[PDB]
Design a protein around this ligand. Structure first.
Ligand SMILES: NC(=O)c1ccc[n+]([C@@H]2O[C@H](COP(=O)([O-])OP(=O)(O)OC[C@H]3O[C@@H](n4cnc5c(N)ncnc54)[C@H](O)[C@@H]3O)[C@@H](O)[C@H]2O)c1
Ligand SMILES: [Zn+2]
Ligand SMILES: [Zn+2]
Ligand SMILES: [Zn+2]
Ligand SMILES: [Zn+2]
Lengths: 375, 375
């Protein structure tokens, strides 16, 4: 393997439109594999770092971590992948030899866990992308906004090759995160009630999951009332717009629910919402799960007696799925009609029109928009 | 059943020496029981409300909520208890028919949960205590600093009659609170490491639980370095005093343990300790437990990524033990030589020297001082 010349959607500057550039993609080194991206979608996390809203801004940069693609070649030492394999890159990985990989509870691999500041590869600290000899930096070790990318093999999930990559690409971030937030972490019992603050693609995976758990009540909570109608299709039974109420939104919920919900799942990334997501669960057994990544440093607060009232609070990342281990299995779940994915997909654009995807999410019009390479 | 005259140590005024008086104990009304008290000990919670540290001063009052005694009579409607049974009054009850009692998760009876303001019985708002026809108020529905007391049956754990009442009386508050915090909420795995903040009766219960639980490293955290020596008997392998460190205490623990403890237990009620207790645990699988009850209203505060890096925060009450159902069981553990309680009892005084117990505890000289009626 040599260096590939391909198209990538490059961000040169914070909060500005992406540019399709001809870039050069270096070959994979030890433990890296080089992937042909076939399909990708946009996740809000891309937008947050694209706006350099919160994080250390780093530009120029190639975003994208929700994708479906094909292994083009593999690096030295790689035994679990080969050219031609159908794969999903995931923003956080699984080495199989750390305590966290070794743990039943955690997916925060000491090696391959999410790192949002890092713009280069693990191996040598260099970027595999460049234009005119200058590095274009990586994202979450995936950088899927390029026709070809290089990803550590540990962050690459081989899946059933008959799976349509243009549906199952959403399984690589948003969908599983919400889903897992519910099934693996909150773990609502049959008949129980669940509150979900945020109804984007993540929130709706969580809803799909609580329904999957047999929750009897799934309360959708969102500031954008226009997200409400579609939400019932994913298992949501009622929606609440905090603006439509004088009461504290957690007080609104506690009253709806003879005291508060059984589980809540936080999907938007607002600390007050987190505060609100925790305080809206029932005492004694309520468990709140935070999953939206916050931009503020605002503290989680509250009178401790809510806890001493035996309410638990768990935080999660990527639905606590182990990437190489579980995710191939989840994809199988769609072939098997447990999971209905087409409905998460509301827009489609060609790679050449990738900027339409930023526009749609920012207008609250899309859940997921699929971007198609080669167009 | 008629009225009883006996000795009681009555508090007429805050922070003042208790005085032994002859009082009258009315018979128990519906769902109540009258208990002959054999042994009682003091507790920091007694001193606080006795000092009128914070709440609403209420005097005259009969304090005491750790005791072992014998059922003398039961009021109409009591079926789970009869005259002669050995019991422990608990500061909080289990009505068995409220929403909390029905749950698997919670021990916070909607009916019988702790109340520090109430001076009379539930049934009728009246006190069963009097001197010359004037009420002496209850404390925590137990008032065990009396030869006889009347207690709602929901607050009485019928226990093993072979149990030495002069040992197992401490199981009804402080001790079980810590113990359960570990074993029921934190649930440290065999071999895991634990940090415990606060080395009072509660901490030492928590420390004891972790030992029982098979923790391999049990780190004690307290500002009074003089509690450190006695903690090793309770399973603590090492202690750290923040006053001996410039560094934030959570940062210190994290380097000592290569990232933070597997489990933590916050036992002081200091909010600053709550933040540290949560932040000193390991990401991915760390679980922090707050059990110390705050005396101030400061909010818990923390950066959200601390959660999303998959830490978990749980608060519990009375160690998540159900008063009527579980406390008898913890007592079996002492019987079966699983629980070593004796090491907690540092003093014994006759009921007549009850004011010494205040002194001993106020000089921080005691863990527990057992008080013996009839002397
Ligand atoms: N933990 C993970 O591994 C993981 C994976 C994917 C996404 N995320 C993060 O999850 C969050 C959601 O992602 P998404 O793609 O589904 O976003 P999205 O923009 O498509 O949806 C966000 C929803 O939350 C709503 N919202 C915004 N502020 C709110 C507030 N104060 N109160 C209530 N609702 C509010 C918005 O209306 C929006 O509909 C993001 O924060 C993302 O960075 C985390
Ligand atoms: Zn994402
Ligand atoms: Zn690992
Ligand atoms: Zn006590
Ligand atoms: Zn009850």
């Amino acid at each position: 393997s040599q260096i590939i010349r391909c198209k990538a959607a490059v961000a040169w500057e914070a909060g500005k439109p992406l540019v399709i550039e001809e870039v050069e993609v270096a070959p994979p080194q030890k433990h890296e594999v080089r992937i042909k991206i076939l399909f990708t979608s946009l996740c809000h996390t891309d937008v947050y770092f694209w706006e350099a809203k919160g994080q250390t801004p780093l530009f120029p940069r190639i975003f994208g971590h929700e994708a479906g693609g094909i292994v083009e070649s593999v690096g030295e030492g790689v035994t679990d992948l080969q050219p031609g394999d159908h794969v999903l890159p995931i923003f956080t990985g699984e080495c199989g030899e750390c305590r966290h990989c070794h743990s039943e509870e955690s997916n925060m691999c000491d090696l391959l866990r999410i790192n949002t500041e890092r713009g280069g590869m693990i191996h040598d600290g260099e970027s595999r992308f460049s234009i005119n000899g200058k590095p274009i930096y990586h994202f979450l070790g995936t950088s899927t906004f390029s026709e070809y990318t290089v990803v550590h093999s540990g962050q690459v999930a081989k899946i059933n090759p008959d799976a349509p990559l243009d549906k199952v690409c959403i399984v690589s971030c948003g969908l599983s995160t919400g889903l897992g937030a519910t099934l693996n972490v909150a773990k609502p019992k049959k008949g129980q009630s669940v509150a979900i603050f945020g109804l984007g693609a993540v929130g709706l995976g969580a809803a799909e999951g609580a329904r999957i758990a047999g929750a009897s009540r799934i309360i959708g909570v969102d500031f954008n009332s226009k997200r409400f109608d579609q939400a019932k299709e994913f298992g949501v039974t009622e929606c609440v717009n905090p603006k439509d109420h004088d009461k504290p939104i957690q007080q609104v919920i506690a009253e709806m629910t003879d005291g508060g919900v059984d589980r809540s799942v936080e999907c938007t990334g607002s600390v007050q919402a987190m505060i609100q997501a925790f305080e809206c669960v029932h005492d004694g057994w309520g468990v709140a799960v935070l999953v939206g990544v916050p931009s503020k440093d605002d503290a989680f607060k509250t009178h401790p007696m809510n806890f001493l009232n035996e309410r638990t609070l768990k935080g999660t990342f990527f639905g606590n799925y182990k990437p190489k281990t579980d995710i191939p299995g989840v994809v199988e779940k769609y072939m098997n009609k447990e999971l209905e994915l087409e409905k998460f997909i509301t827009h489609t654009v060609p790679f050449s029109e990738i900027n339409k995807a930023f526009d749609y999410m920012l207008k609250g019009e899309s859940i997921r928009c699929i971007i198609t390479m080669g167009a």
